[PDB]
Design an enzyme around this catalytic site. Sequence first.
Site, PDB file in Angstrom:
ATOM      1  CD  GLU A   1      -1.470   2.416   1.720  1.00 36.18           C
ATOM      2  OE1 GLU A   1      -0.293   2.448   2.244  1.00 36.18           O
ATOM      3  OE2 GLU A   1      -2.299   3.384   1.710  1.00 36.18           O
TER       4      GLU A   1
ATOM      5  CB  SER B   1     -27.954  25.405 -19.615  1.00 32.74           C
ATOM      6  OG  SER B   1     -29.017  25.235 -18.672  1.00 32.74           O
TER       7      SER B   1
ATOM      8  CG  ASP C   1     -28.656  -8.799  -8.821  1.00 31.51           C
ATOM      9  OD1 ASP C   1     -27.947  -9.040  -7.794  1.00 31.51           O
ATOM     10  OD2 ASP C   1     -28.902  -9.650  -9.743  1.00 31.51           O
TER      11      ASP C   1
ATOM     12  CG  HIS D   1     -17.673   6.988  -8.831  1.00 28.70           C
ATOM     13  ND1 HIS D   1     -18.590   8.012  -8.666  1.00 28.70           N
ATOM     14  CD2 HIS D   1     -18.139   5.952  -8.112  1.00 28.70           C
ATOM     15  CE1 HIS D   1     -19.578   7.588  -7.902  1.00 28.70           C
ATOM     16  NE2 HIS D   1     -19.340   6.339  -7.555  1.00 28.70           N
TER      17      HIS D   1
HETATM   18  C1  LIG Z   1      -1.156  15.849   4.949  1.00 32.40           C
HETATM   19  C2  LIG Z   1      -1.279  14.438   5.458  1.00 32.40           C
HETATM   20  O1  LIG Z   1      -0.321  13.696   5.396  1.00 32.40           O
HETATM   21  N1  LIG Z   1      -2.392  13.983   6.015  1.00 32.40           N
HETATM   22  C3  LIG Z   1      -2.567  12.592   6.474  1.00 32.40           C
HETATM   23  C4  LIG Z   1      -2.690  11.562   5.377  1.00 32.40           C
HETATM   24  C5  LIG Z   1      -2.769  10.124   5.908  1.00 32.40           C
HETATM   25  C6  LIG Z   1      -2.778   9.171   4.702  1.00 32.40           C
HETATM   26  C7  LIG Z   1      -2.918   7.691   5.049  1.00 32.40           C
HETATM   27  N2  LIG Z   1      -2.598   6.924   3.898  1.00 32.40           N
HETATM   28  C8  LIG Z   1      -1.337   6.612   3.539  1.00 32.40           C
HETATM   29  O2  LIG Z   1      -0.319   6.886   4.179  1.00 32.40           O
HETATM   30  N3  LIG Z   1      -1.191   6.118   2.300  1.00 32.40           N
HETATM   31  C9  LIG Z   1       0.084   6.207   1.685  1.00 32.40           C
HETATM   32  C10 LIG Z   1       0.000   5.792   0.218  1.00 32.40           C
HETATM   33  C11 LIG Z   1      -1.041   6.600  -0.571  1.00 32.40           C
HETATM   34  C12 LIG Z   1      -0.921   6.417  -2.080  1.00 32.40           C
HETATM   35  O3  LIG Z   1       0.103   6.045  -2.711  1.00 32.40           O
HETATM   36  O4  LIG Z   1      -2.011   6.697  -2.796  1.00 32.40           O
HETATM   37  C13 LIG Z   1       0.523   7.626   1.683  1.00 32.40           C
HETATM   38  O5  LIG Z   1      -0.286   8.566   1.721  1.00 32.40           O
HETATM   39  O6  LIG Z   1       1.843   7.781   1.589  1.00 32.40           O
HETATM   40  C14 LIG Z   1      -4.293   7.301   5.498  1.00 32.40           C
HETATM   41  O7  LIG Z   1      -5.253   7.092   4.635  1.00 32.40           O
HETATM   42  O8  LIG Z   1      -4.583   7.028   6.651  1.00 32.40           O
HETATM   43  C15 LIG Z   1      -3.508  14.824   6.433  1.00 32.40           C
HETATM   44  C16 LIG Z   1      -4.623  14.943   5.463  1.00 32.40           C
HETATM   45  C17 LIG Z   1      -5.606  13.978   5.435  1.00 32.40           C
HETATM   46  C18 LIG Z   1      -6.694  14.171   4.585  1.00 32.40           C
HETATM   47  C19 LIG Z   1      -6.754  15.318   3.769  1.00 32.40           C
HETATM   48 BR1  LIG Z   1      -8.230  15.667   2.576  1.00 32.40          BR
HETATM   49  C20 LIG Z   1      -5.778  16.307   3.791  1.00 32.40           C
HETATM   50  C21 LIG Z   1      -4.704  16.115   4.681  1.00 32.40           C
HETATM   51 ZN   LIG Z   2      -1.485   2.787   5.766  1.00 30.30          ZN
HETATM   52 ZN   LIG Z   3       0.916   4.951   5.325  1.00 30.88          ZN
END
Ligand SMILES: CC(=O)N(CCCC[C@H](NC(=O)N[C@@H](CCC(=O)O)C(=O)O)C(=O)O)Cc1ccc(Br)cc1
Ligand SMILES: [Zn+2]
Ligand SMILES: [Zn+2]
Lengths: 696, 696
Positions: free
Chosen positions: B370, B574, B612, B635
């Site tokens: 991930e 529109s 369904d 989507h």
């Molecule tokens: C800035 C920041 O870091 N934040 C935290 C992110 C935490 C990400 C985490 N996911 C996770 O680390 N994924 C990996 C791989 C993701 C990929 O390659 O698509 C990553 O981001 O490096 C999770 O979902 O829990 C705060 C934030 C949260 C939401 C919003 Br809208 C705006 C800001």
């Molecule tokens: Zn994670």
């Molecule tokens: Zn992570």
Amino acid sequence: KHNMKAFLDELKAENIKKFLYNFTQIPHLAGTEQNFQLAKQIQSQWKEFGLDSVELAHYDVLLSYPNKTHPNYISIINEDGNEIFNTSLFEPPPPGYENVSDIVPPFSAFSPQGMPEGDLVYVNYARTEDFFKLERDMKINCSGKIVIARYGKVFRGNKVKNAQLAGAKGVILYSDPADYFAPGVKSYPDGWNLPGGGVQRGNILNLNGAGDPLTPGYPANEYAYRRGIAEAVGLPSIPVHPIGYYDAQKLLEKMGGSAPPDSSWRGSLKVPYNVGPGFTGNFSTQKVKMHIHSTNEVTRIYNVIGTLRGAVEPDRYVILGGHRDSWVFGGIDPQSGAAVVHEIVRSFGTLKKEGWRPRRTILFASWDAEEFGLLGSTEWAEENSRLLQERGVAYINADSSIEGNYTLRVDCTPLMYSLVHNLTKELKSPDEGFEGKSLYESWTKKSPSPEFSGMPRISKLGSGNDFEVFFQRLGIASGRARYTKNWETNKFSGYPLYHSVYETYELVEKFYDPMFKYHLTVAQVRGGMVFELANSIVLPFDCRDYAVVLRKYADKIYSISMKHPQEMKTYSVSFDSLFSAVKNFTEIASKFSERLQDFDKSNPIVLRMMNDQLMFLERAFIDPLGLPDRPFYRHVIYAPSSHNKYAGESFPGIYDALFDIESKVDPSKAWGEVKRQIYVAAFTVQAAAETLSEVA
Amino acid sequence: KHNMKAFLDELKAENIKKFLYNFTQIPHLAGTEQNFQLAKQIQSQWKEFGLDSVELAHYDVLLSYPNKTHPNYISIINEDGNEIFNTSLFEPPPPGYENVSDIVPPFSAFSPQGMPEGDLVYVNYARTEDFFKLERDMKINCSGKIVIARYGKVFRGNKVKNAQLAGAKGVILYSDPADYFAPGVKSYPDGWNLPGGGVQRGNILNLNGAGDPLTPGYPANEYAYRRGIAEAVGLPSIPVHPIGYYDAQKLLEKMGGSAPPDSSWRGSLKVPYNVGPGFTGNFSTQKVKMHIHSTNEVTRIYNVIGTLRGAVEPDRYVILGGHRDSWVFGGIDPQSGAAVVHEIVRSFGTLKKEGWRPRRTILFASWDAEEFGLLGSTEWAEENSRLLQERGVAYINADSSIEGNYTLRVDCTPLMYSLVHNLTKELKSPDEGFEGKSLYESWTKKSPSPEFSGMPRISKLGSGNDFEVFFQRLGIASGRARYTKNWETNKFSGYPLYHSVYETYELVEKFYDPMFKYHLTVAQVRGGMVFELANSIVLPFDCRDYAVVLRKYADKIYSISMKHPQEMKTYSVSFDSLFSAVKNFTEIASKFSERLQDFDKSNPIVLRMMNDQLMFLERAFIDPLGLPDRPFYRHVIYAPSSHNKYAGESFPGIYDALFDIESKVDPSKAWGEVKRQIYVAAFTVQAAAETLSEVA
Ligand SMILES: CC(=O)N(CCCC[C@H](NC(=O)N[C@@H](CCC(=O)O)C(=O)O)C(=O)O)Cc1ccc(Br)cc1
Ligand SMILES: [Zn+2]
Ligand SMILES: [Zn+2]
Ligand SMILES: *[C@@H]1O[C@H](CO)[C@@H](O[C@@H]2O[C@H](CO)[C@@H](O[C@@H]3O[C@H](CO[C@H]4O[C@H](CO)[C@@H](O)[C@H](O)[C@@H]4O)[C@@H](O)[C@H](O[C@H]4O[C@H](CO)[C@@H](O)[C@H](O)[C@@H]4O)[C@@H]3O)[C@H](O)[C@H]2NC(C)=O)[C@H](O)[C@H]1NC(C)=O
Ligand SMILES: *[C@@H]1O[C@H](CO)[C@@H](O[C@@H]2O[C@H](CO)[C@@H](O[C@@H]3O[C@H](CO[C@H]4O[C@H](CO)[C@@H](O)[C@H](O)[C@@H]4O)[C@@H](O)[C@H](O[C@H]4O[C@H](CO)[C@@H](O)[C@H](O)[C@@H]4O)[C@@H]3O)[C@H](O)[C@H]2NC(C)=O)[C@H](O)[C@H]1NC(C)=O
Ligand SMILES: CC(=O)N(CCCC[C@H](NC(=O)N[C@@H](CCC(=O)O)C(=O)O)C(=O)O)Cc1ccc(Br)cc1
Ligand SMILES: *[C@@H]1O[C@H](CO)[C@@H](O[C@@H]2O[C@H](CO)[C@@H](O)[C@H](O)[C@H]2NC(C)=O)[C@H](O)[C@H]1NC(C)=O
Ligand SMILES: *[C@@H]1O[C@H](CO)[C@@H](O[C@@H]2O[C@H](CO)[C@@H](O)[C@H](O)[C@H]2NC(C)=O)[C@H](O)[C@H]1NC(C)=O
Ligand SMILES: *[C@@H]1O[C@H](CO)[C@@H](O[C@@H]2O[C@H](CO)[C@@H](O)[C@H](O)[C@H]2NC(C)=O)[C@H](O)[C@H]1NC(C)=O
Ligand SMILES: *[C@@H]1O[C@H](CO)[C@@H](O[C@@H]2O[C@H](CO)[C@@H](O)[C@H](O)[C@H]2NC(C)=O)[C@H](O)[C@H]1NC(C)=O
Ligand SMILES: *[C@@H]1O[C@H](CO)[C@@H](O[C@@H]2O[C@H](CO)[C@@H](O)[C@H](O)[C@H]2NC(C)=O)[C@H](O)[C@H]1NC(C)=O
Ligand SMILES: *[C@@H]1O[C@H](CO)[C@@H](O[C@@H]2O[C@H](CO)[C@@H](O)[C@H](O)[C@H]2NC(C)=O)[C@H](O)[C@H]1NC(C)=O
Ligand SMILES: *[C@@H]1O[C@H](CO)[C@@H](O[C@@H]2O[C@H](CO)[C@@H](O)[C@H](O)[C@H]2NC(C)=O)[C@H](O)[C@H]1NC(C)=O
Ligand SMILES: *[C@@H]1O[C@H](CO)[C@@H](O[C@@H]2O[C@H](CO)[C@@H](O)[C@H](O)[C@H]2NC(C)=O)[C@H](O)[C@H]1NC(C)=O
Ligand SMILES: *[C@@H]1O[C@H](CO)[C@@H](O[C@@H]2O[C@H](CO)[C@@H](O)[C@H](O)[C@H]2NC(C)=O)[C@H](O)[C@H]1NC(C)=O
Ligand SMILES: *[C@@H]1O[C@H](CO)[C@@H](O[C@@H]2O[C@H](CO)[C@@H](O)[C@H](O)[C@H]2NC(C)=O)[C@H](O)[C@H]1NC(C)=O
Ligand SMILES: *[C@@H]1O[C@H](CO)[C@@H](O)[C@H](O)[C@H]1NC(C)=O
Ligand SMILES: *[C@@H]1O[C@H](CO)[C@@H](O)[C@H](O)[C@H]1NC(C)=O
Ligand SMILES: [Ca+2]
Ligand SMILES: [Ca+2]
Ligand SMILES: [Cl-]
Ligand SMILES: [Cl-]
Ligand SMILES: [Zn+2]
Ligand SMILES: [Zn+2]
């Protein structure tokens, strides 16, 4: 009993005849008032015949028409600029129809306007291989020339695209009696041959499944956003016009330059068939000039959609569809099919009024603007694609019911092979000399399969008709059936009077099917299929038949690649993955079939599960990314040939990656893409097989 | 009874704790042996816990690692070329872990190699609007500069893409205590704050849903054809490296050129936050030099896939999935989620051993890689896309169970709003001061929705986690839930120790959730959802809730367009069609709901039909053509923001067509594309509504 025999026995030859007569007294050209009137008639009658609902579904699509006050024609023009010979402005109308108005003159739908002048080059059928011969072998350059090509062998859109890519500035199409005048048979009205003044209408687009040129992906509804013409899909860039062989003779008789390269380039007119360019010395200064003034215009079209609601699985759709628009009278194409559909609806309706309902929902369609690029079927499918995807069991096409009187022709998905075999064993042959024998026996005898004795020929689906969106875009199991001519004598020209004013009720009644028995046999085959698809408890598809053909196609594509042993070594080109996936498909399908036979018949979820697996098996062959540069041909096993829209190609992605590969300048890149397509194909086959594994 | 209460009561806080401890003693970085060992352990235990089958599904995907003998670091370099200051080579390891090996040092995964030297520009958060301010207003040119940006607000991939498009030749990311050091709280190990030496790992790709960079569209299996690196999806073109705020201070303290344009540009370190370019006069000749030597390598990864076969609808799949790979110890991310999944499986297994089975099949997943771009979930979904499309009821994600200890956070499709409301009313709040109250009451009180009093906040799905392929590519109804921090004080930075070596079992046990009660509440929410999705006779989706939000999104996008009244007049823009489709959706959904309540409950086909329709409703929002230049975001209602992958955008096609439109040079063309997206959206809404009409 309300069973298949009851449905079948209600069909009458005499009803089909009456309907054909009714559908063919005036022209029904797409986008015209007369074709709207007939749509309304068909809607009214299907309601009277008993359908639960019958609606019109309209769209505003790009169509093409000649200018009524500024006629299209071609000239030989001399050094002064005098037009010393002019092609015809109209086909001589047939007896008794000489006062019919609104017969559209011959023209190539979607030609741009222009008056180009130049020297002629004769390109035989304007096939890919014809241009290779001309340019590679004979060293003839088509750039800035007007090409003249005979109709036949391949879809005219492909001819035009080929001409265009060779740098032609115009194209002239004509019907050669070598391809449209059968030995011993007289011209219309005294026989079924093409007269010298007859001409084949037809569109010259390269849509590759897009539908309406202005709205690819989405239905052409009232709020649709349209591309500008310059970004429209599939329009030709050079003017085009078709002519009969009286006129063609005048254009060809003066041709000079090189001789034809061999006798397969020579038709049957009394001319040398010189390739050109240009005319022989004394006329060297004369030129050919085209005058094309047709206009493309967004025009309203109308489909008729009839519903017969299923009693048990109303959310499962078996579709019988065929077009209603015609070039002129549509005596064969399409009204011989539409009359067959009309009687099918009538028989189903008869049963319904007595309290019967099919297990699944049957949808009946009268499509518009098929002739202008499968537009009505395609727009409707774009509109309804979610329903079709998730609920579409099968699509049975219903264009022309006859193109000959010799034997049956079926083109369909392998999933319907067993259904077609079984149904035809239970039908009576209409053939002279097989009285009291089954249709299966006569068909098998007259059209043996190349592969298995004791079995009939059944062809793969190509395109050039209204099943294209259902099959190659959406992955819904599809088929078609009609009476046809002898395979052995088949020049793959089509029937002589195809798309001519001469295609009339009388052509059919006098020369093809006077007793309407071939028509009746076709209504039983088409209707029989629909009945079984819509009524059988277990869907009548045999996944094992797909396994068999997948192996044959894999052998075939392997053998094409193996013409290049050295490159296959250098680039490590292996077909192992595809053969493995096909082996797996064979094994899994085999076990699915055992389960399908032995599963517990009392359980309806188990039954709905396994029927869902049968229904979604065709669906599994769709790649949502499409084939390269052809986003609407999504089926990985079958696409229309890149060189001939009417022909089906198997493993088209690999086939096209291999085509002419010895001519690519970067072989590393070309062989890489071959390998990519092998991976795509093997993956898709494996993925399709896995849909037939136990679900959990 | 084997009912939901029985499932729920079997879940234990103490089990989750034990599992968290077990999952977090050594690093489990994707593509390493330790993460393969844990995958095998999880496979073994899920089998012991009672699942019907438990398999590993592996893929060979592009990953990225630093060079162990050639470390990444950044320097200030003087006019002679001496490196007078060097950033850290590693984070100081936490107490008791200082002898753990194989802690990957901080790095930006998928950075290319390079040693660029230049002058610094400070770009705040490197948001789109930050670069607009810099270039448009302040007239600062980033071309050929090294940019330094603070983490926070948006996904780091978007920062990097933005830097790249402004012509930066390198990027330095750092954690500012303004965004990663909460007031009054001590640094790890004595509190939950980020120390000065702490650094946030993470990838910097722009995949836009593609999965493995080398195999977009198809699973990265053994015979996969891979793109060359130069054609790979989503790789950055300039080197990038992250640092902590001790090091950042050294890089920022000498910055000259312009002042920050306002206080939203100033973090909390004792530096001016000058934008640059370059350093103040006495050091004007000193430069910054990056040294990046990481390599991308195709590496094997492993998902664990567990199946609990449905008793009645085995061909319907409810998926609980979350990742297992971690940057280091993964104390919160992801093992706080994985331990929650482990206990969920264990409880379901307990019921199964006593003879129970859910109605539908439940699939459990432990995804790999991930952290390197949702690679394990995406490849598996690419492999299994046909099954998922036709059989996928719902996907519940299960990454970090906590990012705070204040209240519940749910992001999900509107189709799950009612299910979430109902489930949380039946759960006990774990919150101090809501003893004996329901979770719904505490959540509603602490996180009120902006729209309706008496209701809680529920957010749209964004991306940056493993639901992306399921939701925005495949159209499977998805949701996620966890404990979070106060919305009111939320700086949208994430938790301070995110993706740092300091994220440990002890961080959780000491500072977030010592009694494991928040973890237990999250296992009940996630598990509760799964139970109801997999067991309720009628799918627990309410189409009317989609109607409500569709109207809100339509008002919103309308209001953005209406900032340009003159252009809307000139180009005849529109929104009527979209509002009409939304009205229709509201009306049809209303009638479907009446039928769903009043339909005949004895009939299983009718029931399978209507289920369904519920299942394929999310599916109906997929456009197979994708969004512009983003083929895997299909989507039409929800995509990840083009400016921030973590944020969801509604009507993304129209939103992006409208973004910054006043700056486009050809307004006619830009407004045309706005209209095109309106048509696409209205059509899709209408089409989705029609799937809920009577089927025949
Ligand atoms: C800035 C920041 O870091 N934040 C935290 C992110 C935490 C990400 C985490 N996911 C996770 O680390 N994924 C990996 C791989 C993701 C990929 O390659 O698509 C990553 O981001 O490096 C999770 O979902 O829990 C705060 C934030 C949260 C939401 C919003 Br809208 C705006 C800001
Ligand atoms: Zn994670
Ligand atoms: Zn992570
Ligand atoms: C037609 O159907 C057959 C039989 O089902 C499929 O067979 C699979 O074939 C693939 C090869 O493409 C096999 O892949 C190999 O898997 C090994 C591990 O498998 C075990 O563990 C998995 C879970 O991870 C289990 O599901 C499986 O049952 C076994 O327990 C790997 O170790 C192999 O990799 C090593 O060798 C290769 C080959 O030289 C090297 O490239 C690698 O670098 C590595 O060293 C390999 O990946 C797979 O196990 C087979 N599955 C089964 C169930 O037998 C065919 O793939 C299928 N055809 C197509 C086109 O799909
Ligand atoms: C939300 O749901 C509503 C109500 O269901 C839909 O309403 C449809 O609205 C469209 C407009 O987009 C209507 O289209 C019009 O159809 C007329 C003919 O309709 C009759 O015949 C059809 C079959 O062809 C029947 O199904 C229908 O019930 C009627 O019997 C045309 O004559 C109209 O075209 C003329 O006027 C327009 C408008 O000025 C001109 O542009 C044309 O050139 C032409 O002169 C028009 O096409 C449609 O009839 C309505 N259907 C129904 C059942 O009421 C909304 O479309 C839907 N919203 C969305 C976004 O889908
Ligand atoms: C050369 C020729 O004309 N043939 C007859 C074609 C008859 C086409 C007809 N369809 C029909 O006229 N469709 C329209 C619109 C099609 C479109 O726009 O895609 C059209 O082709 O102009 C039909 O399906 O019955 C013979 C032939 C048959 C098969 C093969 Br493989 C090779 C050659
Ligand atoms: C084709 O058949 C239809 C239907 O029988 C005929 O249309 C009918 O015309 C009669 C006489 O004008 C009317 O009273 C009916 O209302 C029409 N019915 C419908 C459903 O339209 C039509 O006249 C026939 N066409 C030809 C050329 O024979
Ligand atoms: C069909 O051709 C006619 C006549 O040859 C066209 O009519 C002329 O068109 C232009 C308008 O753009 C005028 O300048 C002329 O004065 C018209 N002349 C006559 C005699 O009418 C007509 O435009 C063409 N029709 C279509 C649909 O393109
Ligand atoms: C071919 O058709 C053209 C066009 O109608 C004929 O040439 C025209 O003839 C009239 C009457 O002599 C002239 O006023 C026009 O100026 C001519 N138009 C053009 C474009 O040349 C030509 O005579 C016809 N040729 C034959 C052999 O019938
Ligand atoms: C209808 O069937 C008859 C019987 O085959 C066809 O007539 C024969 O045509 C073949 C050539 O294919 C000749 O070998 C026979 O000598 C012909 N006998 C005749 C004309 O009586 C006839 O061609 C068929 N009609 C159509 C339209 O195909
Ligand atoms: C075509 O008919 C054959 C022969 O009746 C069908 O195959 C039989 O199906 C029954 C019922 O499942 C089996 O018990 C027999 O063993 C089958 N016989 C053979 C030789 O296979 C076949 O199912 C029919 N095809 C379709 C699509 O209905
Ligand atoms: C995490 O828990 C697992 C399972 O309880 C432990 O793995 C077991 O290790 C014991 C002792 O070496 C073996 O006898 C078992 O075979 C293992 N089981 C499995 C399924 O792998 C593992 O040791 C624990 N890890 C930590 C760090 O505590
Ligand atoms: C990691 O860095 C090391 C050492 O700084 C690299 O080892 C050198 O690589 C090249 C081979 O392409 C040789 O010319 C040198 O002689 C090697 N030197 C030493 C000391 O080993 C190594 O290539 C890098 N590793 C990766 C995976 O890129
Ligand atoms: C920053 O790290 C670099 C690289 O290790 C140091 O510069 C090296 O120092 C050694 C020993 O003096 C020299 O032999 C190398 O040639 C130098 N390499 C380079 C690239 O300059 C530098 O001393 C370190 N700076 C600080 C302040 O610690
Ligand atoms: C766990 O919950 C406690 C109670 O809210 C948090 O501690 C409080 O934090 C807020 C600031 O948001 C202050 O207003 C209180 O004064 C704090 N009281 C304390 C620390 O005893 C604590 O921050 C939470 N833990 C985590 C990791 O978020
Ligand atoms: C959430 O709970 C509400 C209240 O029980 C459910 O709505 C009820 O559903 C029953 C059974 O269909 C209806 O007869 C009641 O009229 C409903 N009450 C109301 C106010 O709507 C609702 O279905 C539950 N939601 C889900 C997804 O299960
Ligand atoms: C064909 O002719 C045109 C110009 O008259 C020229 O531009 C083109 O290169 C020629 N091509 C070949 C292969 O002779
Ligand atoms: C930024 O700087 C580079 C060269 O040093 C130049 O090529 C580019 O045009 C500049 N752009 C602007 C908007 O100043
Ligand atoms: Ca369209
Ligand atoms: Ca992939
Ligand atoms: Cl047909
Ligand atoms: Cl999550
Ligand atoms: Zn036709
Ligand atoms: Zn036709």
